[PDB]
Amino acid sequence: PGQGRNNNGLEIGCVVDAASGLLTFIANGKELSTYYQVEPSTKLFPAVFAQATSPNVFQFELGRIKNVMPLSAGLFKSEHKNPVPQCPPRLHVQFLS
Amino acid sequence: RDDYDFLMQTSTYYYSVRIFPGQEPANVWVGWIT
Amino acid sequence: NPQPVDTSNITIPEKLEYFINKYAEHSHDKWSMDKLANGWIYGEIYSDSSKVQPLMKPYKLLSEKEKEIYRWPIKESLKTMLAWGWRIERTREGDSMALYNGYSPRAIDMSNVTLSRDLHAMAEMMAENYHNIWAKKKKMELESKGGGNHPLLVPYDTLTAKEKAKDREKAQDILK
């Protein structure tokens, strides 16, 4: 539609199905057409590539949506059955250097 | 209201990225890498 | 010598009417959040002590007799850019946006948007012309009064950062 960021920050949602390898994306509550299918045992790192046009660029939100687990469970084995989202100190942002 | 049984039996995970207002989304890419 | 660059002779283009309406909407919305923060409440009867005022209504519900206070400065600003010959155009993305086309007002935080160096010089020049406009009006008022020379009648270069800040941010927000 356009002006999807100025009124409220644009919200890309990344959904991964570890049992099937299906990668789906939802933008502002609507599911995007682009999807991916990966091979078994693939290790996928959350990644954002951005060119800065603002002092504030983007935000890594570690939340959860309806019927979907937060990233912390899939990352950490101890929190495998913990629906509350978590951001342990091990998880940190890395950049290509 | 999320179904607890579904939440326990599911293997689907989710993270979201908020592009702040004033930052051009054409310059921002979101997804997964290996 | 205070002079504005005269721009009454030239006329506005028809394509910029939608932009004028939209920026009038945005300015009215910012006005609305300012008085909502100040505590002003909506109501047909106007009272200053009660902070009740009928114009915190939606811009479409605004009557025409009040709408000129927003369109006017915008009109003279765009006429000022046109007088200098600044060719203003519209991308196809802007036309696509036009194709897309109680009351809680909400604006766009433009501070995160940033201009280029050329646009910054552009805003500096239009700010100088605004300070010249205000200086000419103030000097006419000052010669009418006959005394009390205003401290800020000095040139724009002599003006400091804080005094220039309001006009600079006006130019900034219009370009944003």
PDB file of C-alpha atoms in Angstrom:
ATOM      1  CA  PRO A   1       0.000   0.000   0.000  1.00  0.00           C
ATOM      2  CA  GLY A   2       2.774   2.468   0.790  1.00  0.00           C
ATOM      3  CA  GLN A   3       3.028   4.607   3.934  1.00  0.00           C
ATOM      4  CA  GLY A   4       3.129   1.285   5.776  1.00  0.00           C
ATOM      5  CA  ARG A   5       6.089   2.464   7.857  1.00  0.00           C
ATOM      6  CA  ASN A   6       5.462   6.184   8.467  1.00  0.00           C
ATOM      7  CA  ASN A   7       2.222   5.765  10.434  1.00  0.00           C
ATOM      8  CA  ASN A   8       3.607   2.753  12.329  1.00  0.00           C
ATOM      9  CA  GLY A   9       6.894   0.919  11.946  1.00  0.00           C
ATOM     10  CA  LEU A  10       6.768  -1.713   9.224  1.00  0.00           C
ATOM     11  CA  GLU A  11       6.620  -5.202  10.731  1.00  0.00           C
ATOM     12  CA  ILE A  12       8.090  -8.145   8.843  1.00  0.00           C
ATOM     13  CA  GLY A  13       7.289 -11.498  10.414  1.00  0.00           C
ATOM     14  CA  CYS A  14       9.456 -14.540   9.675  1.00  0.00           C
ATOM     15  CA  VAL A  15       7.941 -17.993  10.218  1.00  0.00           C
ATOM     16  CA  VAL A  16       9.988 -21.200  10.042  1.00  0.00           C
ATOM     17  CA  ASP A  17       8.655 -24.767  10.244  1.00  0.00           C
ATOM     18  CA  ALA A  18      11.511 -26.905  11.562  1.00  0.00           C
ATOM     19  CA  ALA A  19       9.535 -30.116  10.937  1.00  0.00           C
ATOM     20  CA  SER A  20       8.877 -29.372   7.247  1.00  0.00           C
ATOM     21  CA  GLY A  21      11.442 -26.734   6.257  1.00  0.00           C
ATOM     22  CA  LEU A  22       8.789 -24.307   5.004  1.00  0.00           C
ATOM     23  CA  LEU A  23       9.764 -20.629   5.259  1.00  0.00           C
ATOM     24  CA  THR A  24       6.856 -18.168   5.180  1.00  0.00           C
ATOM     25  CA  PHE A  25       6.821 -14.398   5.692  1.00  0.00           C
ATOM     26  CA  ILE A  26       4.004 -12.200   7.015  1.00  0.00           C
ATOM     27  CA  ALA A  27       4.086  -8.410   6.597  1.00  0.00           C
ATOM     28  CA  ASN A  28       1.778  -6.218   8.707  1.00  0.00           C
ATOM     29  CA  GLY A  29      -0.523  -9.152   9.438  1.00  0.00           C
ATOM     30  CA  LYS A  30      -0.854 -10.432   5.851  1.00  0.00           C
ATOM     31  CA  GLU A  31       1.063 -13.410   4.492  1.00  0.00           C
ATOM     32  CA  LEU A  32       3.493 -12.580   1.690  1.00  0.00           C
ATOM     33  CA  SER A  33       3.589 -14.593  -1.528  1.00  0.00           C
ATOM     34  CA  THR A  34       7.321 -15.331  -1.279  1.00  0.00           C
ATOM     35  CA  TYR A  35       8.124 -18.654   0.392  1.00  0.00           C
ATOM     36  CA  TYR A  36      11.096 -21.007   0.612  1.00  0.00           C
ATOM     37  CA  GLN A  37      11.648 -24.744   1.038  1.00  0.00           C
ATOM     38  CA  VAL A  38      14.927 -25.879   2.601  1.00  0.00           C
ATOM     39  CA  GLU A  39      16.547 -29.284   2.966  1.00  0.00           C
ATOM     40  CA  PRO A  40      16.518 -31.272   6.225  1.00  0.00           C
ATOM     41  CA  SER A  41      19.131 -30.408   8.889  1.00  0.00           C
ATOM     42  CA  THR A  42      19.550 -26.880   7.480  1.00  0.00           C
ATOM     43  CA  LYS A  43      20.782 -24.375  10.073  1.00  0.00           C
ATOM     44  CA  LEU A  44      19.143 -20.985   9.504  1.00  0.00           C
ATOM     45  CA  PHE A  45      20.415 -17.782  11.144  1.00  0.00           C
ATOM     46  CA  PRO A  46      18.008 -14.845  11.529  1.00  0.00           C
ATOM     47  CA  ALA A  47      19.452 -12.137   9.306  1.00  0.00           C
ATOM     48  CA  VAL A  48      18.648  -8.544   8.359  1.00  0.00           C
ATOM     49  CA  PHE A  49      20.490  -6.712   5.577  1.00  0.00           C
ATOM     50  CA  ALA A  50      19.872  -2.978   5.751  1.00  0.00           C
ATOM     51  CA  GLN A  51      21.360   0.218   4.339  1.00  0.00           C
ATOM     52  CA  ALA A  52      21.030   3.011   6.877  1.00  0.00           C
ATOM     53  CA  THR A  53      18.838   5.915   5.793  1.00  0.00           C
ATOM     54  CA  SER A  54      17.993   6.847   9.407  1.00  0.00           C
ATOM     55  CA  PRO A  55      19.786   6.937  12.772  1.00  0.00           C
ATOM     56  CA  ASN A  56      17.384   4.176  13.857  1.00  0.00           C
ATOM     57  CA  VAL A  57      17.475   1.377  11.288  1.00  0.00           C
ATOM     58  CA  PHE A  58      15.508  -1.629  12.545  1.00  0.00           C
ATOM     59  CA  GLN A  59      14.698  -3.758  15.585  1.00  0.00           C
ATOM     60  CA  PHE A  60      15.083  -7.482  16.272  1.00  0.00           C
ATOM     61  CA  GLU A  61      11.815  -8.432  17.975  1.00  0.00           C
ATOM     62  CA  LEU A  62      11.875 -11.879  19.594  1.00  0.00           C
ATOM     63  CA  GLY A  63       8.132 -12.234  20.145  1.00  0.00           C
ATOM     64  CA  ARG A  64       5.588 -14.843  19.139  1.00  0.00           C
ATOM     65  CA  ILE A  65       2.293 -14.985  17.260  1.00  0.00           C
ATOM     66  CA  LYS A  66      -0.818 -17.164  17.473  1.00  0.00           C
ATOM     67  CA  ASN A  67      -0.082 -20.923  17.468  1.00  0.00           C
ATOM     68  CA  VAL A  68       3.643 -20.243  16.916  1.00  0.00           C
ATOM     69  CA  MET A  69       6.637 -20.698  19.246  1.00  0.00           C
ATOM     70  CA  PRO A  70       9.148 -17.901  19.948  1.00  0.00           C
ATOM     71  CA  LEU A  71      12.674 -18.144  18.548  1.00  0.00           C
ATOM     72  CA  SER A  72      14.186 -18.821  21.993  1.00  0.00           C
ATOM     73  CA  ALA A  73      12.737 -22.349  22.170  1.00  0.00           C
ATOM     74  CA  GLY A  74      14.235 -23.383  18.841  1.00  0.00           C
ATOM     75  CA  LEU A  75      17.531 -21.749  19.707  1.00  0.00           C
ATOM     76  CA  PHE A  76      17.909 -23.102  23.250  1.00  0.00           C
ATOM     77  CA  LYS A  77      17.274 -26.701  24.281  1.00  0.00           C
ATOM     78  CA  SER A  78      16.468 -25.792  27.899  1.00  0.00           C
ATOM     79  CA  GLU A  79      13.599 -23.511  26.790  1.00  0.00           C
ATOM     80  CA  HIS A  80      12.190 -26.001  24.269  1.00  0.00           C
ATOM     81  CA  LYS A  81       8.782 -26.088  25.989  1.00  0.00           C
ATOM     82  CA  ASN A  82       8.684 -22.513  27.325  1.00  0.00           C
ATOM     83  CA  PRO A  83       6.115 -20.391  25.420  1.00  0.00           C
ATOM     84  CA  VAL A  84       7.290 -17.185  27.109  1.00  0.00           C
ATOM     85  CA  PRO A  85       9.715 -15.427  24.721  1.00  0.00           C
ATOM     86  CA  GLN A  86      13.268 -15.021  25.995  1.00  0.00           C
ATOM     87  CA  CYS A  87      16.481 -13.278  24.941  1.00  0.00           C
ATOM     88  CA  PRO A  88      19.348 -14.949  26.827  1.00  0.00           C
ATOM     89  CA  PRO A  89      22.750 -13.212  26.850  1.00  0.00           C
ATOM     90  CA  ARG A  90      24.146 -15.802  24.419  1.00  0.00           C
ATOM     91  CA  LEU A  91      21.929 -14.408  21.652  1.00  0.00           C
ATOM     92  CA  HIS A  92      23.561 -11.281  20.221  1.00  0.00           C
ATOM     93  CA  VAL A  93      23.724  -9.358  16.954  1.00  0.00           C
ATOM     94  CA  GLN A  94      26.646 -10.103  14.630  1.00  0.00           C
ATOM     95  CA  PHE A  95      27.706  -8.219  11.511  1.00  0.00           C
ATOM     96  CA  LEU A  96      29.783  -9.159   8.481  1.00  0.00           C
ATOM     97  CA  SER A  97      33.266  -7.692   8.902  1.00  0.00           C
TER      98      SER A  97
ATOM     99  CA  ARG B   1      -6.113 -17.800  23.067  1.00  0.00           C
ATOM    100  CA  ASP B   2      -3.358 -20.163  21.953  1.00  0.00           C
ATOM    101  CA  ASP B   3      -3.902 -23.907  22.191  1.00  0.00           C
ATOM    102  CA  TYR B   4      -1.426 -25.271  24.728  1.00  0.00           C
ATOM    103  CA  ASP B   5      -1.350 -28.752  23.171  1.00  0.00           C
ATOM    104  CA  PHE B   6      -0.621 -27.258  19.745  1.00  0.00           C
ATOM    105  CA  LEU B   7       2.031 -24.993  21.287  1.00  0.00           C
ATOM    106  CA  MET B   8       3.710 -28.012  22.878  1.00  0.00           C
ATOM    107  CA  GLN B   9       3.523 -30.287  19.808  1.00  0.00           C
ATOM    108  CA  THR B  10       4.505 -27.652  17.228  1.00  0.00           C
ATOM    109  CA  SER B  11       7.988 -27.166  15.775  1.00  0.00           C
ATOM    110  CA  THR B  12       7.220 -23.765  14.224  1.00  0.00           C
ATOM    111  CA  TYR B  13       9.237 -20.744  15.378  1.00  0.00           C
ATOM    112  CA  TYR B  14       8.888 -17.026  14.730  1.00  0.00           C
ATOM    113  CA  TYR B  15      10.839 -13.795  14.971  1.00  0.00           C
ATOM    114  CA  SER B  16       9.832 -10.368  13.699  1.00  0.00           C
ATOM    115  CA  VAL B  17      11.751  -7.285  12.568  1.00  0.00           C
ATOM    116  CA  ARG B  18      10.407  -3.744  12.948  1.00  0.00           C
ATOM    117  CA  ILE B  19      11.675  -1.231  10.402  1.00  0.00           C
ATOM    118  CA  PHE B  20      11.440   2.106  12.182  1.00  0.00           C
ATOM    119  CA  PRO B  21       9.640   5.021  10.506  1.00  0.00           C
ATOM    120  CA  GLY B  22      12.039   7.115   8.456  1.00  0.00           C
ATOM    121  CA  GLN B  23      14.098   4.118   7.291  1.00  0.00           C
ATOM    122  CA  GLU B  24      13.474   3.176   3.666  1.00  0.00           C
ATOM    123  CA  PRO B  25      12.239  -0.449   3.487  1.00  0.00           C
ATOM    124  CA  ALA B  26      13.638  -0.828  -0.039  1.00  0.00           C
ATOM    125  CA  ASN B  27      17.068  -0.678   1.631  1.00  0.00           C
ATOM    126  CA  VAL B  28      16.136  -3.358   4.201  1.00  0.00           C
ATOM    127  CA  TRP B  29      16.011  -7.130   3.668  1.00  0.00           C
ATOM    128  CA  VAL B  30      14.663  -9.629   6.208  1.00  0.00           C
ATOM    129  CA  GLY B  31      14.913 -13.408   6.269  1.00  0.00           C
ATOM    130  CA  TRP B  32      17.273 -16.278   7.054  1.00  0.00           C
ATOM    131  CA  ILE B  33      20.830 -17.125   6.006  1.00  0.00           C
ATOM    132  CA  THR B  34      23.116 -20.121   6.458  1.00  0.00           C
TER     133      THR B  34
ATOM    134  CA  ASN C   1      18.128  44.977   3.035  1.00  0.00           C
ATOM    135  CA  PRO C   2      15.116  42.719   3.719  1.00  0.00           C
ATOM    136  CA  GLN C   3      13.379  41.552   0.520  1.00  0.00           C
ATOM    137  CA  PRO C   4      11.531  38.367  -0.342  1.00  0.00           C
ATOM    138  CA  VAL C   5      12.086  37.002  -3.816  1.00  0.00           C
ATOM    139  CA  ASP C   6       8.820  38.132  -5.398  1.00  0.00           C
ATOM    140  CA  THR C   7       6.639  35.201  -6.425  1.00  0.00           C
ATOM    141  CA  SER C   8       3.075  36.552  -6.671  1.00  0.00           C
ATOM    142  CA  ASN C   9       3.216  36.784 -10.473  1.00  0.00           C
ATOM    143  CA  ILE C  10       3.755  33.055 -11.070  1.00  0.00           C
ATOM    144  CA  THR C  11       1.017  30.467 -10.522  1.00  0.00           C
ATOM    145  CA  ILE C  12       0.860  27.032  -8.892  1.00  0.00           C
ATOM    146  CA  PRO C  13       0.685  23.777 -10.890  1.00  0.00           C
ATOM    147  CA  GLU C  14      -2.379  21.564 -10.704  1.00  0.00           C
ATOM    148  CA  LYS C  15      -0.412  18.411  -9.831  1.00  0.00           C
ATOM    149  CA  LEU C  16       0.715  19.911  -6.516  1.00  0.00           C
ATOM    150  CA  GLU C  17      -2.874  20.381  -5.296  1.00  0.00           C
ATOM    151  CA  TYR C  18      -2.951  16.857  -3.843  1.00  0.00           C
ATOM    152  CA  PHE C  19       0.350  17.484  -2.049  1.00  0.00           C
ATOM    153  CA  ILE C  20      -0.990  20.793  -0.731  1.00  0.00           C
ATOM    154  CA  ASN C  21      -4.100  19.074   0.635  1.00  0.00           C
ATOM    155  CA  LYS C  22      -2.092  16.235   2.192  1.00  0.00           C
ATOM    156  CA  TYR C  23       0.455  18.535   3.852  1.00  0.00           C
ATOM    157  CA  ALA C  24      -2.391  20.721   5.105  1.00  0.00           C
ATOM    158  CA  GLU C  25      -3.853  17.558   6.636  1.00  0.00           C
ATOM    159  CA  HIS C  26      -0.512  16.733   8.262  1.00  0.00           C
ATOM    160  CA  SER C  27      -0.012  20.267   9.612  1.00  0.00           C
ATOM    161  CA  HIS C  28      -3.547  20.280  11.016  1.00  0.00           C
ATOM    162  CA  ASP C  29      -2.869  16.892  12.609  1.00  0.00           C
ATOM    163  CA  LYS C  30       0.323  18.144  14.291  1.00  0.00           C
ATOM    164  CA  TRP C  31      -1.622  21.199  15.471  1.00  0.00           C
ATOM    165  CA  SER C  32      -4.170  18.763  16.920  1.00  0.00           C
ATOM    166  CA  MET C  33      -1.603  16.683  18.817  1.00  0.00           C
ATOM    167  CA  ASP C  34      -0.057  19.890  20.149  1.00  0.00           C
ATOM    168  CA  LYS C  35      -3.352  20.997  21.702  1.00  0.00           C
ATOM    169  CA  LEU C  36      -4.245  17.457  22.798  1.00  0.00           C
ATOM    170  CA  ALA C  37      -0.962  17.438  24.718  1.00  0.00           C
ATOM    171  CA  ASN C  38      -1.819  20.921  26.004  1.00  0.00           C
ATOM    172  CA  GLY C  39      -5.185  19.516  27.129  1.00  0.00           C
ATOM    173  CA  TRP C  40      -7.537  21.172  24.637  1.00  0.00           C
ATOM    174  CA  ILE C  41     -10.743  19.201  24.039  1.00  0.00           C
ATOM    175  CA  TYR C  42     -13.078  19.132  21.047  1.00  0.00           C
ATOM    176  CA  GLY C  43     -16.402  20.971  21.125  1.00  0.00           C
ATOM    177  CA  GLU C  44     -18.480  23.263  18.917  1.00  0.00           C
ATOM    178  CA  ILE C  45     -18.527  26.075  21.481  1.00  0.00           C
ATOM    179  CA  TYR C  46     -15.183  27.877  21.765  1.00  0.00           C
ATOM    180  CA  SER C  47     -13.852  28.812  25.209  1.00  0.00           C
ATOM    181  CA  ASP C  48     -10.236  29.626  26.042  1.00  0.00           C
ATOM    182  CA  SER C  49     -10.335  28.860  29.777  1.00  0.00           C
ATOM    183  CA  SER C  50     -12.223  25.595  29.207  1.00  0.00           C
ATOM    184  CA  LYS C  51      -9.805  24.578  26.405  1.00  0.00           C
ATOM    185  CA  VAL C  52     -12.789  23.694  24.202  1.00  0.00           C
ATOM    186  CA  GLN C  53     -12.409  24.447  20.505  1.00  0.00           C
ATOM    187  CA  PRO C  54     -14.276  23.107  17.443  1.00  0.00           C
ATOM    188  CA  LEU C  55     -11.331  22.596  15.104  1.00  0.00           C
ATOM    189  CA  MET C  56      -9.778  19.382  16.577  1.00  0.00           C
ATOM    190  CA  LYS C  57     -12.180  17.600  14.198  1.00  0.00           C
ATOM    191  CA  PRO C  58     -10.970  15.616  11.147  1.00  0.00           C
ATOM    192  CA  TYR C  59      -9.590  17.672   8.248  1.00  0.00           C
ATOM    193  CA  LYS C  60     -12.462  16.605   5.983  1.00  0.00           C
ATOM    194  CA  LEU C  61     -14.928  17.811   8.625  1.00  0.00           C
ATOM    195  CA  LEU C  62     -13.004  21.099   8.753  1.00  0.00           C
ATOM    196  CA  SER C  63     -14.872  23.896   7.012  1.00  0.00           C
ATOM    197  CA  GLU C  64     -13.287  25.782   4.126  1.00  0.00           C
ATOM    198  CA  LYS C  65     -13.286  29.101   6.009  1.00  0.00           C
ATOM    199  CA  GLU C  66     -10.596  27.688   8.309  1.00  0.00           C
ATOM    200  CA  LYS C  67      -8.637  25.635   5.768  1.00  0.00           C
ATOM    201  CA  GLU C  68      -6.789  28.598   4.236  1.00  0.00           C
ATOM    202  CA  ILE C  69      -4.533  29.045   7.284  1.00  0.00           C
ATOM    203  CA  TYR C  70      -2.748  25.832   6.296  1.00  0.00           C
ATOM    204  CA  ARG C  71      -2.849  26.033   2.492  1.00  0.00           C
ATOM    205  CA  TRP C  72      -1.688  29.676   2.396  1.00  0.00           C
ATOM    206  CA  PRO C  73       1.884  29.283   3.807  1.00  0.00           C
ATOM    207  CA  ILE C  74       2.245  26.104   1.763  1.00  0.00           C
ATOM    208  CA  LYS C  75       1.158  28.003  -1.360  1.00  0.00           C
ATOM    209  CA  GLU C  76       3.695  30.780  -0.797  1.00  0.00           C
ATOM    210  CA  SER C  77       6.411  28.222  -0.019  1.00  0.00           C
ATOM    211  CA  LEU C  78       5.826  26.291  -3.247  1.00  0.00           C
ATOM    212  CA  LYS C  79       5.617  29.584  -5.144  1.00  0.00           C
ATOM    213  CA  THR C  80       8.975  30.522  -3.586  1.00  0.00           C
ATOM    214  CA  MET C  81      10.577  27.305  -4.825  1.00  0.00           C
ATOM    215  CA  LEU C  82       9.025  27.842  -8.271  1.00  0.00           C
ATOM    216  CA  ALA C  83      10.222  31.466  -8.447  1.00  0.00           C
ATOM    217  CA  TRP C  84      13.827  30.280  -8.082  1.00  0.00           C
ATOM    218  CA  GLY C  85      13.064  27.851 -10.914  1.00  0.00           C
ATOM    219  CA  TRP C  86      13.373  24.669  -8.848  1.00  0.00           C
ATOM    220  CA  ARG C  87      11.873  22.034 -11.152  1.00  0.00           C
ATOM    221  CA  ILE C  88       9.523  19.967  -8.980  1.00  0.00           C
ATOM    222  CA  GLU C  89       8.482  16.586 -10.373  1.00  0.00           C
ATOM    223  CA  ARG C  90       6.595  13.470  -9.264  1.00  0.00           C
ATOM    224  CA  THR C  91       7.816   9.888  -9.377  1.00  0.00           C
ATOM    225  CA  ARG C  92       5.536   7.070 -10.501  1.00  0.00           C
ATOM    226  CA  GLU C  93       5.592   5.889  -6.883  1.00  0.00           C
ATOM    227  CA  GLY C  94       3.854   9.140  -5.943  1.00  0.00           C
ATOM    228  CA  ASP C  95       1.160   8.485  -8.546  1.00  0.00           C
ATOM    229  CA  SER C  96       0.764   4.953  -7.179  1.00  0.00           C
ATOM    230  CA  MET C  97       0.273   6.459  -3.720  1.00  0.00           C
ATOM    231  CA  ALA C  98      -2.481   8.680  -5.129  1.00  0.00           C
ATOM    232  CA  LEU C  99      -3.997   5.551  -6.686  1.00  0.00           C
ATOM    233  CA  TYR C 100      -4.093   4.016  -3.203  1.00  0.00           C
ATOM    234  CA  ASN C 101      -5.673   7.330  -2.108  1.00  0.00           C
ATOM    235  CA  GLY C 102     -13.789   9.100  17.639  1.00  0.00           C
ATOM    236  CA  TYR C 103     -10.951  10.997  15.955  1.00  0.00           C
ATOM    237  CA  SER C 104      -7.425  10.271  17.185  1.00  0.00           C
ATOM    238  CA  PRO C 105      -4.990  12.333  15.078  1.00  0.00           C
ATOM    239  CA  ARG C 106      -1.554  10.910  14.323  1.00  0.00           C
ATOM    240  CA  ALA C 107       1.305  12.361  12.273  1.00  0.00           C
ATOM    241  CA  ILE C 108       4.570  11.050  10.801  1.00  0.00           C
ATOM    242  CA  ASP C 109       7.793  11.460  12.799  1.00  0.00           C
ATOM    243  CA  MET C 110       9.916  13.023  10.047  1.00  0.00           C
ATOM    244  CA  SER C 111      13.061  13.413  12.169  1.00  0.00           C
ATOM    245  CA  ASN C 112      14.241   9.932  11.181  1.00  0.00           C
ATOM    246  CA  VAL C 113      14.003  10.852   7.493  1.00  0.00           C
ATOM    247  CA  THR C 114      17.191  12.609   6.373  1.00  0.00           C
ATOM    248  CA  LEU C 115      17.907  14.850   3.393  1.00  0.00           C
ATOM    249  CA  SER C 116      20.976  14.924   1.167  1.00  0.00           C
ATOM    250  CA  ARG C 117      23.634  17.649   1.169  1.00  0.00           C
ATOM    251  CA  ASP C 118      22.091  19.357  -1.868  1.00  0.00           C
ATOM    252  CA  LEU C 119      18.660  19.272  -0.218  1.00  0.00           C
ATOM    253  CA  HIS C 120      20.233  20.675   2.955  1.00  0.00           C
ATOM    254  CA  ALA C 121      21.614  23.624   0.986  1.00  0.00           C
ATOM    255  CA  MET C 122      18.183  23.954  -0.635  1.00  0.00           C
ATOM    256  CA  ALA C 123      16.524  24.153   2.790  1.00  0.00           C
ATOM    257  CA  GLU C 124      19.145  26.652   3.955  1.00  0.00           C
ATOM    258  CA  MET C 125      18.369  28.919   0.987  1.00  0.00           C
ATOM    259  CA  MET C 126      14.600  28.702   1.478  1.00  0.00           C
ATOM    260  CA  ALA C 127      15.132  29.407   5.191  1.00  0.00           C
ATOM    261  CA  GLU C 128      17.162  32.491   4.298  1.00  0.00           C
ATOM    262  CA  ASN C 129      14.269  33.649   2.114  1.00  0.00           C
ATOM    263  CA  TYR C 130      11.815  33.026   4.983  1.00  0.00           C
ATOM    264  CA  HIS C 131      13.975  35.054   7.345  1.00  0.00           C
ATOM    265  CA  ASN C 132      14.035  37.811   4.715  1.00  0.00           C
ATOM    266  CA  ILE C 133      10.223  37.667   4.446  1.00  0.00           C
ATOM    267  CA  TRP C 134       9.829  37.957   8.210  1.00  0.00           C
ATOM    268  CA  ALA C 135      12.510  40.657   8.352  1.00  0.00           C
ATOM    269  CA  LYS C 136      10.739  42.764   5.725  1.00  0.00           C
ATOM    270  CA  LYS C 137       7.407  42.448   7.533  1.00  0.00           C
ATOM    271  CA  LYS C 138       9.046  43.259  10.873  1.00  0.00           C
ATOM    272  CA  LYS C 139      10.882  46.246   9.386  1.00  0.00           C
ATOM    273  CA  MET C 140       7.637  47.609   7.940  1.00  0.00           C
ATOM    274  CA  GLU C 141       6.035  47.219  11.375  1.00  0.00           C
ATOM    275  CA  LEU C 142       9.170  48.731  12.974  1.00  0.00           C
ATOM    276  CA  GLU C 143       9.149  51.819  10.739  1.00  0.00           C
ATOM    277  CA  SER C 144       5.422  52.165  11.424  1.00  0.00           C
ATOM    278  CA  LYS C 145       6.173  52.184  15.161  1.00  0.00           C
ATOM    279  CA  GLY C 146       9.280  54.327  14.675  1.00  0.00           C
ATOM    280  CA  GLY C 147      11.429  52.842  17.422  1.00  0.00           C
ATOM    281  CA  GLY C 148      12.642  49.807  19.308  1.00  0.00           C
ATOM    282  CA  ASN C 149      14.878  48.238  16.666  1.00  0.00           C
ATOM    283  CA  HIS C 150      14.424  44.488  16.837  1.00  0.00           C
ATOM    284  CA  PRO C 151      17.559  42.506  17.809  1.00  0.00           C
ATOM    285  CA  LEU C 152      17.025  39.794  15.174  1.00  0.00           C
ATOM    286  CA  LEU C 153      16.804  42.206  12.210  1.00  0.00           C
ATOM    287  CA  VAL C 154      20.489  41.338  11.649  1.00  0.00           C
ATOM    288  CA  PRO C 155      21.438  39.193   8.608  1.00  0.00           C
ATOM    289  CA  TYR C 156      20.771  35.460   8.517  1.00  0.00           C
ATOM    290  CA  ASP C 157      24.508  34.783   8.813  1.00  0.00           C
ATOM    291  CA  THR C 158      24.566  36.940  11.951  1.00  0.00           C
ATOM    292  CA  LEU C 159      21.611  34.943  13.299  1.00  0.00           C
ATOM    293  CA  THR C 160      22.695  32.116  15.585  1.00  0.00           C
ATOM    294  CA  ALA C 161      21.666  28.462  15.550  1.00  0.00           C
ATOM    295  CA  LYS C 162      18.778  28.581  18.032  1.00  0.00           C
ATOM    296  CA  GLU C 163      17.164  31.636  16.428  1.00  0.00           C
ATOM    297  CA  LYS C 164      17.466  30.016  12.988  1.00  0.00           C
ATOM    298  CA  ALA C 165      16.253  26.636  14.284  1.00  0.00           C
ATOM    299  CA  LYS C 166      12.501  27.166  13.845  1.00  0.00           C
ATOM    300  CA  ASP C 167      12.775  28.338  10.240  1.00  0.00           C
ATOM    301  CA  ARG C 168      15.351  25.654   9.437  1.00  0.00           C
ATOM    302  CA  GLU C 169      13.075  22.913  10.777  1.00  0.00           C
ATOM    303  CA  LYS C 170      10.149  24.379   8.836  1.00  0.00           C
ATOM    304  CA  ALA C 171      12.173  23.999   5.635  1.00  0.00           C
ATOM    305  CA  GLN C 172      13.288  20.552   6.801  1.00  0.00           C
ATOM    306  CA  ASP C 173       9.761  19.273   7.424  1.00  0.00           C
ATOM    307  CA  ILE C 174       8.371  20.607   4.153  1.00  0.00           C
ATOM    308  CA  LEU C 175      11.189  18.913   2.210  1.00  0.00           C
ATOM    309  CA  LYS C 176      10.733  15.729   4.257  1.00  0.00           C
TER     310      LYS C 176
END
